[PDB]
Amino acid sequence: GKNKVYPLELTLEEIFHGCLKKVAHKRKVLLFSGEYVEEERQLTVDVKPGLPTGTRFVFEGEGNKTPKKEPGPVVFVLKPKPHPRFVRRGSDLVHKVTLPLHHALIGTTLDIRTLDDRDLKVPISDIMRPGSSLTVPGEGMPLPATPSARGNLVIEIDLLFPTHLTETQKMLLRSAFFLPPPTEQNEETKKALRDYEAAFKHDLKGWATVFKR
Template identity: 50%
Template sequence: MGKDYYDELGLTRSATDIDIKKAYRKLALKYHPDKNETAAASTKFAAVAEAYDVLSNAKNKGFYDLYGEEGLKQGVSDGKGGRRGGFYKFSTSPTLVFDQFFGTNNPYAALSEISESFEAMTATPKLKRGKQKTFDITVSLEDIFYGCIKKVPHTKKILTASGTFETQDRILTLDIKPGCKDGTRFVFDNEGNEAPHTEPGPVIYTLSTQKHPSFKRKGADLVYTAIVPLVKALSGTTLEIKTLDDRILSIPITEIVQQGSNKLIVGEGLPKGDGSKGDMLVVFDLLFPASLSDSQKMLLNAAFFLPPKPTAEQADAVKTFGVAFKDQLKGWSAGYKK
């Protein structure tokens, strides 16, 4: 008596194609050599592979149902001196049958894929995500320095199932921390417009800093442009800079200043998240006179060409000039500011 392929798969002859596939899937995973290393499991794995190979093929299954395993493999008499059947031989390896069925030789990968497919079929369908709405929020540099709370009005539209619109007015609160970076996004989930079968999208506000009359922002650092008259750039001066928190920084400039040169003032920038502060970079922009008289040109030349070691007569001339220049009543330095 030949093999009973239906019995190998735990089925009856009334089994459908779907029943055959389900039975093979279950038994092949159970007896795969990588999961069950016993000799009996290896024998069973090969048996269910052959049974599936026969019963999943319409021609093989039809002949087997009529003449059994012997007729399928060895053939039967046709009553005319010839034979029918005898065309099947299980020449494919059980592992190849498994690979062709699952798309992998790894039983654990096959189990994972089956699990994911089942979850996908049984999971609750995800709602379509609504569009995100993006707005800009611009604040002053002082607000960035101290931190602030901004409340913005927001209107949410709701499309009802009947096709009409309703609106909801609400206030969204933005907690802007000290030193908050440009480009920071404040995300309010589910505050977008609503529609049937649609999950509301987010409303997003993106931070930017307003232009400031004195400073430019560069991350946590501040850039201050100091306009310095040429004479002060050469002879020295003291800069007075009003900070964002209303202090006055007095910065002595004792060396000759070049156009575009800079001076770093540590710790006078914007707050950082770690409790420290950025720096202030003072960039010098020199202010040149629009014109010079012949006397002014002569005096400039006199200053630049003064010898390192003047003679007694030259020293007396400089002293006389200084007295005339600085005289509180008649000297032309009186009242000079720039």
Template identity: 45%
Template sequence: MSVDYYAVLEINRNATDADIKKSYRRLSLKYHPSSNRGPGSADKFNELAEAYDVLSDPRKKATYDKFGEEGLKGGIPAEFGENGAWTSGYVYHGNPEKIFRKFFGGDNPFADFYSKDGNEVAIGYNCLQGRGGKTHDSPIERDLQLALDDLFHGCTKKIKISRRVMNEDGYTSSIRDKILTIVVKPGWNEGTRITFPKEGDQGPNSIPSDIVFIVRQKCHPWFVRQNNDLLFTAQISLGMALTGFSLDIDTLDGRILNVPVNDIVHPKYTKVVTGEGMPLAKDPSQRGNLIISFDTTFPQKLSAERKHLIKQALAF
């Protein structure tokens, strides 16, 4: 009884080379003796290897398509052969593991199903039996450095990544570039995570990693962020601390904020300006506070006359 190699691989005669490879991958993993010890699985695994060995080779496939199994294995007449002689018949070597290992590459085609320490991963042989899906690679995390101005106003960042992508044949791959767009919302905090699902390297036996960008805030020349508040330190003289003054601060939205200070500025004194901090991520119309602390500069020397005048002033 002749063998229908197309039926063995569960494909039709119009199947492409990619279809042949895809079907062999699926069925060989399903019926591999390491994962399927059911009755007839070893014979099925062997039949799959022979069918793939023939249909994946253009010359063998062409001979089989025209002359069937008899012509393939018995040789074909001179007028169809080369050098005026009968072609030698095809003989299957009978080693399905050889076909399997050549297809998946390396001496251990099941390497993708094990962790780095050699232990079997949680999905086990469910992948091989077609029940459990593929392994999911760990997320790839990258820092996204943003200026305080970007986090105040919001912005759009475009990041080019290079990743390995599977080709149409299902088992080779190539490196391709892709642009990922991140829309930064006003008020985002340090540590905000932006996830792009399955944008990592692709592989035949794995689900691509998620790519995760983590917001990292760059230092600002004069503001320090504390949650939704902005901290600002003003340099003042001792005379200003005792007698009052007016402070001009350049804001992140391009204004000059005038802050009068009429209190005596003692070492623990702070001035809070409501609503002049960072936008709230959940409601950018609301803002935190601006908290001003002061660094008072003391004179290095005082003449006897000035000391006397200061004593008189403070005596009241």
């Protein structure tokens, strides 16, 4: 009636690829002596790619053996160790990334390192809203039912806003957020924009390219 449960901890790489784990069990045969007798049994557990969390492997016949009652089965419950990058949800993978504001607005590439040894560089397709997510199909954990299909990786975007802005920076931001459409601009506007851009991308006195220190 009673069964002994045991957590079995795996890394996301093992579950992604499919491990063949060996586990040690302390079985207690109870006898007339006050001390019980313990032995170490070896068990091979085959975890197939993409097995869902909470999977139970039950070994029947193993367990502490009282003199009269045949021991009940032992249970191993799958659980994943924490990963530095991905947290698995259902069948796919969630990657939480802290993103600066200009990377959101202007748009850049997020560089992520998959469980498989590949390096994805996913572009920011549009203005990423606060709490928005970017989905890359066919990049999550494999489907346990079919060993070829994959889930879709989910990147939950967290925006990192700047802590300080000067009044001239705010003036530039305001001018960037109210520029008239290109079919409504004056000639003075066009010449001013040309001058400012040529003075911002100046190869020696311009600050488009700065070397860190």
